[PDB]
DNA sequence: ATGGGACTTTTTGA
DNA sequence: TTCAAAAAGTCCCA
């Protein structure tokens, strides 16, 4: 339903927009929260406004109607002309209306600008000086399909495919912000790097000046909520400089109440600060300090190939109901399944650097079951146990897929070959050579080398550089940060990784072969692997001139 | 009970 | 026909 923003963040966002407002020049500022809820932001806006008017009451009295500008009239003026809110939930609006009314503690029917409505559909009849708040976050699975049709038709500039509802709130906030106005919101951080956020990033960069980005990375800002947050402050002021302040957290384990204010935390050693030229932003926003930019640019300039140039990428199997098709390799039910139907099956946790654990699970590649009479035992006793849920998959409702078939069985011959596999979400680079024809779900991605690039790049060389500390840091510069100690390792970024080939190729490959050989023996002395990795990292840093 | 850690399905638009 | 993206993740315990 409704999510509670921490008070320290609310106060920071309100101060960000109002701390330098010239109330003498403009005593009628319009401040709007478009998903105000119970008024976490708007009630704080009231307090800031009240002090602002009271500190300058005599100056306003002298400059303007001296009967209008009294301390006793500040409450009425704020509610009539300054505070605006919208929310879909009428109970929240009712509570906020009482809270705003009780700030005074009837005289005559004071009107409060609170709208119970869908903020994305409301005919907004004027623009606003300042916009603050915390919009709803709803992804592609959890957003109602009927509503998505409206968003795709009307918010197509920021919303396509797997985009999120809060993209549209960025759009609406920008569109109804007054010229010279200031907006400050807390949203998920994912749009900063995600493929879905590309159009939204283009919309922001070309319509507002981004003053500041506070990136909390994987820190837990909302207690008991699995989301990662950032704060964006932007304006429509005519400026020539357009440089962004970026505050990036250093330690994700920090608790947000370290000081009384967020400014103390931002200026502390817990955060790093650097500046980014908004004019230099491409479709991607590479937000790193100068040392990392130099590091990243050296590697990009030195590497003449990308993984996409040399490799074929694919996502793993999607059965659509794992419990129906995935069995423990020691399950007695597998005696019913001819081994021609059985594939080795691994999870993301089975991928280490350079090699995969031995599989403990088997997939029934049910697409190869010819019909329901020749293998009735498998259908009745294993797969049919989940027949109702299997029939509710989209391709079964439409008749594209039989009820016992895998939803997305892919191509078997893609998996039954030497290939490289990596987990879809990890704390570090973990690229392994698969020797055992392992299948996997979508928590593991795979690629193999194009035949015309085999004489330039071997699998052993590739897992060598890809698992190095250099490439771990290099990938994480632009990688999508998901939660604490987790990055997405998806092809839309993994395949952009650039690779090189030079005089160190042979020794890097040989070091990788030694690592693999040690990792695969029984009396495993894991320690020497670390020494070999350090030597390989030195060769790689020498190659890339870092 | 909360807060922190290990781990990751299938729905969905294109 | 069939690809790949998506954390207001999910679930557990001390
Ligand atoms: O969570 C943050 C706050 O945000 C409010 N809020 C959500 N969503 C809209 C909204 N429009 C989008 C509607 C999306 C939708 C479509 C179908 C069914 C259910 C939701 N407009 C104004 N406040 C909103 C919530 O009430 C809450 O207080
Ligand atoms: K006057
Ligand atoms: K988080």
Cα atoms in the Cβ-side hemisphere of radius 13 Å centred on A224: 2
Measured distance CA(A441)–CA(A438) in Å, rounded: 10
Distance from C-alpha of A367 to C-alpha of A384, rounded to nearest angstrom: 14
CATH number corresponding to A7-282: 3.40.50.150
**Residues A337, A342, A347, A352, CA torsion sign:** positive
Q: What is the CA radius of gyration of chain A?
A: 29
**Buried b or exposed e, range A425-439, using 16+ CB within 10 angstroms:** ebeebbbbbbeeebb
User: CA-CA distance, A130 to A18, in Å (whole number)?
Assistant: 8
Rounded to whole angstroms, what are the CA distances from A230 to A35, A211, A221, A224, A452?
A: 17, 13, 9, 17, 44
Q: What is the 3-state secondary structure (H, E, C) of A414-429?
A: HHCCCEEEEECEECCC
Q: Which residue is nearest to nucleotide C4 (CA to C1')?
A: A315
A255 touches strand B (CB under 7 A): yes
Say whether the CB atom of A393 is under 7 angstroms from strand B.
Answer: yes
Residue ranges of E strands in A48-143: 83-87, 113-116, 128-133
Name the packing angle between helices A469-478 and A527-544 (round to 10°): 60
Ligand nearest to the CA of A486: 3
Report d(CA A92, CA A74) in Å as an integer. Answer: 25
CA–CA gap between residue A353 and residue A7 (Å, rounded): 43
Eight-class DSSP state of A406: -
Q: Residue A432 is encoded by which pair of tokens?
A: 């392994």
Round to whole Å and give the CA distance between A282 and A274. Answer: 18
Scanning the structure block, which residue is given the tokens 């399950």? A331
Alpha-carbon distance of A114 to A38, in angstroms, equals 11
Resolution of this structure in Å: 2.3
Interhelix angle A7-18/A42-55, rounded to 10 degrees, is: 40
Instruction: List the residue whose alpha carbon is closest to atom 23 of ligand 1.
Output: A87
Sign of CA dihedral A279, A283, A287, A293: negative
The contacts of residue A374 (CB under 8 Å, 6+ apart) are none
Using the 8-state DSSP alphabet, how is residue A472 labeled?
H
The first and second tokens of residue A541, run together, are: 């840093």
Domain with CATH 3.40.50.150 in chain A: 7-282
Cα end-to-end distance, chain A, whole Å: 50
Asked if residue A486 keeps its beta carbon closer than 7 A to nucleic acid strand B, the reply is yes
Ligand 1 site, residue A89, Cβ cutoff 6 A: yes
Residue A345 φ/ψ, nearest 5 degrees: -135, 125
Pocket flag, ligand 1, residue A3 (CB < 6 Å): yes
Name the residue at shortest CA distance from atom 9 of ligand 1.
A88
Experimental determination approach used: X-ray
Query: Can you tell me whether residue A185 is helix, strand or coil?
Result: strand
């Amino acid at each position: 339903g409704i999510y509670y923003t921490p008070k320290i963040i609310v106060d920071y966002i309100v101060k960000k927009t109002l701390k330098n407002h010239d109330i003498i020049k403009n005593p009628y500022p319009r401040i709007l929260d478009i998903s105000c809820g119970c008024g976490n932001f708007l009630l704080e806006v009231y307090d800031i406004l009240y002090d602002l008017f009271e500190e300058n009451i005599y100056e306003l009295k002298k400059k303007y109607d001296e009967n209008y500008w009294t301390v006793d009239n500040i409450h009425r003026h704020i509610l009539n002309y300054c505070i605006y809110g919208a929310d879909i939930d009428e109970k929240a609006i009712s509570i906020l209306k009482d809270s705003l009314t009780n700030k005074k503690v009837d005289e005559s029917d004071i009107k409060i600008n609170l709208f119970c409505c869908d903020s994305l559909k409301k005919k907004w009849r004027y623009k606003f000086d300042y916009i603050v708040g915390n919009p709803p976050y709803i992804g592609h699975k959890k957003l109602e399909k009927k509503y998505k049709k409206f968003l795709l038709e009307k918010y197509s500039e920021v919303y396509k495919d797997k985009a999120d509802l809060y993209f549209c709130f960025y759009k609406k906030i920008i569109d109804i912000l007054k010229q010279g106005g200031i907006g400050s919101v807390i949203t998920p951080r994912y749009f900063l790097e995600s493929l879905s956020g590309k159009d939204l990033r283009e919309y922001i960069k070309s319509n507002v000046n981004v003053q500041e980005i506070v990136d909390f990375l994987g820190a837990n800002i909302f207690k008991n909520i699995g989301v990662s947050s950032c704060i964006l402050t932007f304006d429509k002021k005519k400026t020539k400089e357009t440089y962004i302040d970026v505050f990036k957290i250093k330690n994700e384990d920090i608790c947000i109440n370290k000081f009384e204010t967020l400014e103390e935390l931002l200026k502390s050693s817990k955060f790093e600060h650097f500046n980014i030229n908004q004019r230099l932003l491409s479709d991607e926003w590479i937000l790193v300090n100068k040392d990392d930019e130099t590091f990243y640019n050296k590697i990009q300039e030195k590497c003449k190939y990308s993984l996409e140039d040399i490799a074929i990428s694919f996502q793993g199997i999607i059965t659509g109901c794992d419990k129906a098709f995935i069995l423990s390799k020691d399950d007695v039910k597998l005696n019913l399944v001819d081994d021609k139907f059985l594939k080795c099956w691994i999870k993301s946790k089975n991928i280490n650097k350079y090699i995969v654990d031995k599989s403990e699970y088997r997939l029934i590649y049910s697409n190869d079951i010819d019909n329901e009479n020749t293998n009735k035992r498998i259908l009745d006793e294993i797969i049919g146990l989940y027949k109702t849920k299997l029939e509710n998959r989209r391709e079964c409702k439409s008749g594209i897929r039989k009820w016992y078939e895998l939803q997305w069985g892919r191509e078997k011959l893609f998996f039954e070959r030497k290939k490289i596999m990596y987990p879809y979400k990890s704390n570090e680079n973990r690229f392994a050579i698969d020797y055992d024809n392992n299948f996997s779900s979508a928590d593991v991605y795979s690629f193999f080398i194009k035949e015309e690039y085999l004489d330039k790049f071997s699998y052993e060389y590739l897992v060598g550089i890809l698992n190095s500390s250099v490439y771990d840091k290099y990938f994480k510069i632009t990688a999508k940060k998901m939660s604490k100690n987790i990055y997405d390792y998806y092809p839309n970024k993994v395949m952009k990784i650039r690779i090189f080939r030079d005089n160190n190729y042979e020794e890097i490959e040989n070091l990788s072969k030694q690592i693999i050989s040690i990792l695969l023996n029984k009396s495993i002395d894991k320690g020497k692997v670390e020494k070999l990795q350090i030597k390989m990292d030195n060769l790689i840093m020498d190659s890339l001139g870092i």
